[PDB]
Structure 1
Amino acid sequence: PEWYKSAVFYELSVRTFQDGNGDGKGDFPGLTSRLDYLKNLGVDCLWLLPWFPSPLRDDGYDVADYRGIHPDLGTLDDFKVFLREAHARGLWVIGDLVTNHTSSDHPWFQAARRGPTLPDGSPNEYHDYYVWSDEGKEYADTRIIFTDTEVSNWTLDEQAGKYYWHRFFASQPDLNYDNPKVVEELHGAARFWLDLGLDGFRVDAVPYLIEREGTSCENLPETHEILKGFRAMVDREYPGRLLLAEAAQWPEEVVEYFGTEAEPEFHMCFNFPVMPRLYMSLKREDTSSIREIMGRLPKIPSFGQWCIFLRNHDELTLEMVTDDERAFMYAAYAPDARMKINVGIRRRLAPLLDNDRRRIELLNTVLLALPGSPVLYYGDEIGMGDDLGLPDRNGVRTPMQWNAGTSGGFSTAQPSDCFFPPIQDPVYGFGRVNVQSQLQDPSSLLKWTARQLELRRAHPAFAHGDLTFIETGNPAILAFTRQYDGETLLIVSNFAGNAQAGLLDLAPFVGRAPVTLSGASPLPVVTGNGQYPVVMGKYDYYWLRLNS
């Protein structure tokens, strides 16, 4: 199978991982100096947030130059050294390709805003790189994504005297994919990095490329067409590289981003649909929403693999759940107003779960056991918290906590000189939560996570198996099998905070002998009608093999 199917991904922000030069900003030399940590954790692929020059109004997702390294992060040479060192350790690396929009500081937009013709009457070739309007009335009733900042998807530019489209901040003007030149520019950006040996891209905001009058301006066939263009380019010119889509949409919309066997699109898509139902099922002590949303996911192509995740650098998005699920989620996971942003919840995993290690482990087990390749958000493996005093979504992007020394080991500069301040509170601060402590503590979360990955790695059915949900007679207990190449796994998870009984329907496995993956402790052989009783402790996870 393709490499990305067997990978474990790790998401990090270079500016926030390791400062290698004392200026309070993370950088590539710093990242390079920490690759053994990632190697030894059990990670195979690093996904780096945007590393491009940018005034950072959306933390680098406002790109000013696609073919450069932001000066905070070092130089292109540093980037090539990093990539060489990552590759030498068996780490693949993917970048973040921001296709839908650029910074307003990008030279193209600086050019475009002069208007349709240059001062001397000549056509301004860059004007058409962006999406302009006389009165900002096209595409009405299309949704606003950054609901807490933007009141419209059109903003008046003072210099051009016309409106320009933007699905995100006003400082992120949308690119005009009806202009063939724009398409070519982004194929070119992609080539630049793939020519350096980058293993692929996470592609940002894929559903919003094309706008059409009388549509939602999301998931349009025309957008898919373009994305297939990217795939074909990579298949012809860079065989084996990964395209991974950020498509935060309903199940049936998301699965379209894989394309077809005849017309391939992405290799991978994040499982956005399952992610909120994990947190919901935990609070409701009822896992039906997980089965229901997985059941709405169509079959994907041969080459396709889901990318499973718990959290990421953004808020926990609630955009694609119902109004009642959303309200439930806010009540359960955002009791203070400042915890919410833009139709979502800007908190880290450990805080979301009351720092309850039994729950954190539970959800990580499900992360690793569902069909796909999992992605860890940096620092969740040590139980980092958040800083909701920081604006926007920056409170989940505080510096990695390496040790208890100056600024959590992130930098030799003092905390208050760090790009974002390293967490110091009594619960989650680097005094208490840091890699070094957890390397010495035999029972740490760091250790637990590396061990759980090693356990996953010893059973390829987690990465490659099919999935079948098993009836349990108790909504609190989730059970499924993963089968691949002669091994059947049975995964049984209790989402309730107290002990629970179930009656598993193991009819198809009469005469099979369940044993724990860890140590092969035997459970009773399945007999009779195969209705198999279980009890589980609070937040328990049973990882089993059904010997044939």
Structure 2
Amino acid sequence: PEWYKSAVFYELSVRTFQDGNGDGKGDFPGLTSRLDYLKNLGVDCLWLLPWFPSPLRDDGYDVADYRGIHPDLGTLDDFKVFLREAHARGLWVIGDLVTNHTSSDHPWFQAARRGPTLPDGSPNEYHDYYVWSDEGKEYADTRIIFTDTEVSNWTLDEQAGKYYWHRFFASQPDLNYDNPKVVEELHGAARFWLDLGLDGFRVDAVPYLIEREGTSCENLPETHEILKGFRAMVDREYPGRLLLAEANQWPEEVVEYFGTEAEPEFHMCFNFPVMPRLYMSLKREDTSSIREIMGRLPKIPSFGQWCIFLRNHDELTLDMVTDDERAFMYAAYAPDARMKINVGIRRRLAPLLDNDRRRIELLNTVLLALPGSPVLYYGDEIGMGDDLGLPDRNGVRTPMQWNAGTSGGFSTAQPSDCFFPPIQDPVYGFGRVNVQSQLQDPSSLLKWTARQLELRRAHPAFAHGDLTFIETGNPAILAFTRQYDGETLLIVSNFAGNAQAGLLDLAPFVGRAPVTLSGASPLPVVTGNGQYPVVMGKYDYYWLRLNS
């Protein structure tokens, strides 16, 4: 099969991971020094947030040059050396392709706002790069994404005298993708990095490329064709690279981003519909939500794989849940209004689970045992908390915490001088939550996370198995099998805080023994009617095999 199908992914931000020269910013040499770490954890492919020159208004998703390295993070040599030293270790690396928009400080915009007519009278070929309107009345009936900041998806440019369009911050003018010169500048931006050896892109904000009037301007088939043309160029020019979509849309609409067998689009997408069901089901001791939204997912192509995640650099998004669902989410996971942002909760994973490692472990095992390829957000694998005194979503992006030295060992500059303050609260601060500690601690979240990844590696059904939900008698208990190449897994997991009892329907499996995936320990043989009786301690996970 495909390398992205069997790979464990790991999301990190170069500016925040490790600083080698001591200027308080994470740099590519620093990150290179830490690849030994990531490889021993069980990681297969690093995914790097945008590393491109940028004013960092949206932390570098406001790209100001797709073809250089941001000075903060070192040089192109620094980048080149990093990607080598990662490939010599068997890590794949992918980047972030900011395709929907560019910064207002891009040299494209800085020209487009001059007017459709240059001084001499010629047409300014760059004004057509971004979308403009004279009154700003167009594409209404359209949803605003960063409502806490932005009143209007249009903004007036004091020098272009028109309104430009932006699905996110005012400083990120949307790119006119009706202009086939823009599909080529983008095809070029991707080519430049694939030419350097890069193993793929996560493509950011794909639903929002094209905007048609009388529609929502999300998931337009005009948009999907542009993507198709991208996978076209990647499939022809650079075989085997990985295109990963971030599509947070309803079950049906998201699978459209895989394209079809005939007409490929993305290799994997983020399973954004399950992640909130994971959380909201944990507080309800009801696994029904998980099972519903999973049924609603249409089969994806052969080449496609899902990408399971718990958290990321962004808020816990809550805009593809029902109105009762999102209100529940706020009441169980956002007690402080400071924790709300743009329809979502902006908290790290451990703080979301009240630092309960029984819970942190349980969600992480679901994340491994669901069909897809898991992605761990950096720091979560050692239990990092957040800092909601920081603006926007930066609260979950504080510096990695390697030890209890100066600035958690992320930099030799004082914590006041690191790009984001290294957490030092008495519960999640780096005096308590740091990699050094957890490699000496025989039973740390870090040793646990790595050992679990080792277990999953030992069972390809986790990567390539099918998914069959097994009835239990108990909504707090979520059971499913995974079959692939003869081996059948049975993943039973308690989503409740105290002992739960359950009656599993292993009727298909009468005669077979469940044995633990670790310890090689057999339970009783499935017998008679196959109603398998089971008790579960709080927040437990049973990883089992069914032999023959």
Q: Secondary structure at the match of 1:189?
A: helix
Counterpart-to-counterpart distance in 2, 1:121 and 1:238: 41
Counterpart-to-counterpart distance in 2, 1:308 and 1:68: 31
Counterpart-to-counterpart distance in 1, 2:349 and 2:543: 22
C-alpha displacement at 1:172, in angstroms? 0.1
Q: Secondary structure at the match of 2:371?
A: coil
C-alpha displacement at 1:145, in angstroms? 0.2
Q: Secondary structure at the match of 2:443?
A: coil
Counterpart-to-counterpart distance in 2, 1:401 and 1:484: 38
In the TM superposition, what whole-angstrom CA distance separates every residue of 1:464-490 from its partner, at most 9, and x where no partner exists? 000000000100000000000010000
Counterpart-to-counterpart distance in 2, 1:24 and 1:458: 40
C-alpha displacement at 1:306, in angstroms? 0.3
C-alpha displacement at 1:72, in angstroms? 0.2
C-alpha displacement at 1:177, in angstroms? 0.3
Counterpart-to-counterpart distance in 2, 1:103 and 1:248: 22
Q: Secondary structure at the match of 1:4?
A: coil
- What does residue 473 of structure 1 align with? 473
Counterpart-to-counterpart distance in 1, 2:414 and 2:426: 18
Counterpart-to-counterpart distance in 2, 1:320 and 1:119: 48
Q: Secondary structure at the match of 1:481?
A: strand
In the TM superposition, what whole-angstrom CA distance separates every residue of 1:390-449 from its partner, at most 9, and x where no partner exists? 000000000000000000000000000000000000100000000000000000000000
4+ aligned runs moved over 6 Å, structure 1: none
Q: Secondary structure at the match of 2:244?
A: strand
C-alpha displacement at 1:120, in angstroms? 1.4
Counterpart-to-counterpart distance in 2, 1:232 and 1:107: 28
Q: Secondary structure at the match of 1:411?
A: coil
Counterpart-to-counterpart distance in 2, 1:278 and 1:297: 15
Return the TM-score normalized by structure 1. 1.00
Q: Secondary structure at the match of 1:482?
A: strand
C-alpha displacement at 1:176, in angstroms? 0.4
C-alpha displacement at 1:532, in angstroms? 0.3
Counterpart-to-counterpart distance in 1, 2:145 and 2:437: 40
In the TM superposition, what whole-angstrom CA distance separates every residue of 1:360-400 from its partner, at most 9, and x where no partner exists? 00000000000000000000000000000000000000000
C-alpha displacement at 1:340, in angstroms? 0.6
Q: Secondary structure at the match of 2:384?
A: coil
Counterpart-to-counterpart distance in 2, 1:159 and 1:121: 17
In the TM superposition, what whole-angstrom CA distance separates every residue of 1:472-509 from its partner, at most 9, and x where no partner exists? 01000000000000100000000000000010000000
Counterpart-to-counterpart distance in 2, 1:192 and 1:202: 15
Q: 2:96–2:201: 8 Å Cα contact kept in structure 1?
A: yes
C-alpha displacement at 1:17, in angstroms? 0.1
Equivalent pairs counted in the alignment come to: 548
C-alpha displacement at 1:350, in angstroms? 0.1
Q: Secondary structure at the match of 1:217?
A: coil
Q: 2:28–2:82: 8 Å Cα contact kept in structure 1?
A: yes
Q: 2:141–2:215: 8 Å Cα contact kept in structure 1?
A: no
In the TM superposition, what whole-angstrom CA distance separates every residue of 1:309-350 from its partner, at most 9, and x where no partner exists? 000000000011011100000010000000010000000000
C-alpha displacement at 1:45, in angstroms? 0.2
Q: Secondary structure at the match of 2:167?
A: coil
- What does residue 412 of structure 2 align with? 412
C-alpha displacement at 1:95, in angstroms? 0.2
- What does residue 341 of structure 1 align with? 341
Q: Secondary structure at the match of 1:116?
A: coil
Counterpart-to-counterpart distance in 2, 1:342 and 1:396: 15
Q: 2:63–2:102: 8 Å Cα contact kept in structure 1?
A: yes
Q: 2:64–2:107: 8 Å Cα contact kept in structure 1?
A: yes
Counterpart-to-counterpart distance in 1, 2:182 and 2:442: 53
C-alpha displacement at 1:83, in angstroms? 0.2
- What does residue 454 of structure 1 align with? 454
**Structure 2, gaps ≥5 residues long:** none
- What does residue 77 of structure 1 align with? 77
- What does residue 507 of structure 1 align with? 507
In the TM superposition, what whole-angstrom CA distance separates every residue of 1:253-299 from its partner, at most 9, and x where no partner exists? 00000000000000000000000000011000000000000000000
C-alpha displacement at 1:98, in angstroms? 0.4
Counterpart-to-counterpart distance in 2, 1:460 and 1:93: 22
In the TM superposition, what whole-angstrom CA distance separates every residue of 1:76-97 from its partner, at most 9, and x where no partner exists? 0000000000000000000000
Counterpart-to-counterpart distance in 1, 2:162 and 2:313: 33
C-alpha displacement at 1:139, in angstroms? 0.5
In the TM superposition, what whole-angstrom CA distance separates every residue of 1:45-99 from its partner, at most 9, and x where no partner exists? 0000000000000000000000000000010000000000000000000000000
Q: 2:499–2:538: 8 Å Cα contact kept in structure 1?
A: yes
Q: Secondary structure at the match of 2:308?
A: strand
C-alpha displacement at 1:453, in angstroms? 0.1
Counterpart-to-counterpart distance in 2, 1:67 and 1:248: 27
Q: Secondary structure at the match of 1:478?
A: strand
Counterpart-to-counterpart distance in 1, 2:459 and 2:147: 43
C-alpha displacement at 1:519, in angstroms? 0.8
Counterpart-to-counterpart distance in 2, 1:442 and 1:400: 21
Counterpart-to-counterpart distance in 1, 2:222 and 2:242: 22
Counterpart-to-counterpart distance in 2, 1:185 and 1:222: 18
In the TM superposition, what whole-angstrom CA distance separates every residue of 1:118-143 from its partner, at most 9, and x where no partner exists? 01111110000000000000001200
Counterpart-to-counterpart distance in 2, 1:247 and 1:124: 34
C-alpha displacement at 1:211, in angstroms? 0.1
- What does residue 544 of structure 2 align with? 544
C-alpha displacement at 1:32, in angstroms? 0.3
In the TM superposition, what whole-angstrom CA distance separates every residue of 1:139-174 from its partner, at most 9, and x where no partner exists? 012000001000010000000000000000000000
Pairwise CA RMSD: 0.3
- What does residue 58 of structure 1 align with? 58
Q: 2:97–2:190: 8 Å Cα contact kept in structure 1?
A: yes
Q: Secondary structure at the match of 2:358?
A: helix
Q: Secondary structure at the match of 2:16?
A: helix
Q: Secondary structure at the match of 2:492?
A: strand
In the TM superposition, what whole-angstrom CA distance separates every residue of 1:508-533 from its partner, at most 9, and x where no partner exists? 00000000011111110000010000
Counterpart-to-counterpart distance in 2, 1:308 and 1:203: 16
In the TM superposition, what whole-angstrom CA distance separates every residue of 1:215-235 from its partner, at most 9, and x where no partner exists? 000000000000000001011
- What does residue 47 of structure 1 align with? 47
Q: 2:398–2:420: 8 Å Cα contact kept in structure 1?
A: yes
Counterpart-to-counterpart distance in 2, 1:163 and 1:297: 38
Return the TM-score normalized by structure 2. 1.00
Q: Secondary structure at the match of 2:491?
A: strand
Q: 2:141–2:214: 8 Å Cα contact kept in structure 1?
A: no
Counterpart-to-counterpart distance in 1, 2:494 and 2:221: 41
Q: Secondary structure at the match of 1:95?
A: strand
Q: Secondary structure at the match of 2:95?
A: strand
C-alpha displacement at 1:544, in angstroms? 0.2
- What does residue 305 of structure 1 align with? 305
C-alpha displacement at 1:192, in angstroms? 0.2
Counterpart-to-counterpart distance in 2, 1:469 and 1:407: 46
Alignment of 1:431-446 (within 5 A): 431-446=431-446
Q: Secondary structure at the match of 1:231?
A: helix
Counterpart-to-counterpart distance in 2, 1:415 and 1:422: 6
In the TM superposition, what whole-angstrom CA distance separates every residue of 1:173-201 from its partner, at most 9, and x where no partner exists? 00000000000000000000000000000
Counterpart-to-counterpart distance in 1, 2:13 and 2:369: 26
Counterpart-to-counterpart distance in 1, 2:332 and 2:85: 43
Q: 2:386–2:398: 8 Å Cα contact kept in structure 1?
A: yes
Q: Secondary structure at the match of 1:164?
A: strand
Q: 2:113–2:157: 8 Å Cα contact kept in structure 1?
A: yes
Counterpart-to-counterpart distance in 1, 2:157 and 2:319: 29
Q: Secondary structure at the match of 1:300?
A: coil
Q: Secondary structure at the match of 2:532?
A: strand
Q: Secondary structure at the match of 1:330?
A: helix
